[PDB]
Amino acid sequence: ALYEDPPDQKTSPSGKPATLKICSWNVDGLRAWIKKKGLDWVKEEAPDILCLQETKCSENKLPAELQELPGLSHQYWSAPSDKGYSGVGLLSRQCPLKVSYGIGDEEHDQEGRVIVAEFDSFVLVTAYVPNAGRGLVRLEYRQRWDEAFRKFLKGLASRKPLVLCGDLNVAHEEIDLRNPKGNKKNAGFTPQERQGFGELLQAVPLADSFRHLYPNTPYAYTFWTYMMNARSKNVGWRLDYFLLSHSLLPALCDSKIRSKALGSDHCPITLYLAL
DNA sequence: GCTGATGCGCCGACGGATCC
DNA sequence: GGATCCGTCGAACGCATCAGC
């Protein structure tokens, strides 16, 4: 079945107006993505904060269009030092108070997967979580990475509520992908990755914004393989999330999936917060 | 400089068996 | 015997390196 995101709900449940718009997008190669007019779509979305994963692009190679963004002038970029893979970036209208990279030791383990930005009222973390890999050859690493990440997020020294967004590389429940049964030994839907997502929600604690608003809505995915025309058939996975501290839930106006925006094998997701 | 080949990381279609 | 379960296998993308010219 196809999916149609419901209209944008820009008022919190109790009636406050959204004041912060956050967009997150795994662009699957930032230079490719720009050539496929991804920035055009960002300009129309007009977010206050833009989080990108899988940029596959060091900061020296960033196209000049990214400098013709006056509403997103504070730009922070991260690439791993070894490997054209990974990469993440955070662009904000307003200057954040603090920015950091990695989950504990990035200065020696330069991985380019996590950016932390502190604002007045909240802490934003954007993440590109390591893939368990084909044949699960890196699942144990992911399990160990998951545990270091939980503790890092728990260990934030801020009393400020937390927003965690990006590609978490797991479809939490069966509702979150089109072929749950044929994929339970595939990366992204193993019991191990799913349990780690569950423990993230519980340990931090955090709520799945989209699922909190739409607890029973099936067929809502953020990734489709380029292959076999999966996107046209909406054979996809929900791999990209906005996860909120419990305190931020009354502020939650909506969590969107921008199914129709092309340019990657992931589509954008967008958070509306009334702060 | 430029192209395209190969290498690498990132599952749904298919065929066959089992179940009542 | 239609539905379901299970395992195998090919291949769209982007980017780096490399060979050749």
Side-chain angles (χ1 to χ4, degrees), chain A residues 1-81 84 86-158 160-275:
Chain A
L2 302 111
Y3 174 79
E4 298 174 353
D5 218 28
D8 287 22
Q9 183 40 241
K10 305 197 192 171
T11 330
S12 91
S14 67
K16 292 67 185 155
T19 55
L20 183 61
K21 193 180 187 174
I22 299 172
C23 181
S24 176
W25 203 349
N26 177 327
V27 300
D28 176 50
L30 190 147
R31 282 164 300 186
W33 166 76
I34 270 155
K35 291 174 186 202
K36 291 177 282 188
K37 307 315 184 48
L39 263 187
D40 287 17
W41 185 93
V42 174
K43 291 178 171 158
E44 297 193 307
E45 185 73 343
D48 300 288
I49 302 185
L50 179 66
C51 301
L52 313 174
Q53 307 82 41
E54 240 182 278
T55 63
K56 300 186 153 206
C57 178
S58 56
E59 209 191 320
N60 53 336
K61 294 309 195 107
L62 282 177
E65 291 99 330
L66 282 167
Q67 322 328 337
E68 326 292 283
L69 289 177
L72 297 170
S73 59
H74 312 88
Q75 301 188 354
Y76 309 88
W77 301 98
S78 205
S81 47
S86 266
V88 292
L90 187 136
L91 305 79
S92 177
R93 164 172 72 85
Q94 308 192 97
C95 194
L97 310 161
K98 309 160 186 170
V99 179
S100 63
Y101 302 94
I103 59 180
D105 197 24
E106 182 91 351
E107 60 162 18
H108 304 102
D109 192 18
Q110 171 150 349
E111 293 287 355
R113 291 186 178 279
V114 170
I115 302 177
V116 181
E118 192 189 307
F119 291 91
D120 282 336
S121 322
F122 70 102
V123 172
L124 174 64
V125 175
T126 199
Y128 175 46
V129 172
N131 200 279
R134 285 265 161 85
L136 303 177
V137 290
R138 290 214 72 124
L139 181 52
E140 275 187 63
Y141 177 92
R142 159 70 167 273
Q143 283 171 282
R144 293 189 294 271
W145 190 94
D146 278 5
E147 175 175 4
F149 192 43
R150 287 201 299 283
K151 309 219 249 210
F152 161 80
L153 289 181
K154 220 188 155 91
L156 275 170
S158 197
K160 282 180 193 178
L162 168 60
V163 176
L164 166 61
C165 78
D167 186 356
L168 306 182
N169 257 317
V170 58
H172 183 200
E173 302 293 344
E174 299 206 9
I175 184 155
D176 297 299
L177 72 169
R178 166 97 273 284
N179 295 315
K181 300 148 77 174
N183 279 335
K184 203 171 139 130
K185 308 156 80 132
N186 194 103
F189 201 58
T190 69
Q192 290 73 22
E193 294 156 298
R194 291 169 68 185
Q195 181 72 2
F197 188 99
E199 298 170 7
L200 179 70
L201 296 187
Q202 182 165 350
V204 175
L206 295 160
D208 181 334
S209 68
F210 176 84
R211 209 44 96 190
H212 174 256
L213 300 167
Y214 313 101
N216 304 307
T217 300
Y219 302 121
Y221 311 132
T222 63
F223 154 86
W224 313 261
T225 183
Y226 285 122
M227 306 272 255
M228 301 317 304
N229 299 284
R231 190 145 183 189
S232 63
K233 311 171 204 167
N234 192 42
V235 189
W237 311 41
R238 193 167 72 94
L239 303 179
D240 307 272
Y241 303 74
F242 287 106
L243 310 182
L244 294 318
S245 290
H246 192 66
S247 47
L248 284 165
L249 284 194
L252 174 61
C253 310
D254 206 348
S255 188
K256 318 305 298 165
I257 298 162
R258 304 306 199 194
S259 322
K260 315 192 296 200
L262 315 173
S264 154
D265 41 10
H266 295 246
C267 76
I269 60 166
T270 294
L271 185 71
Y272 284 106
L273 293 187
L275 300 164

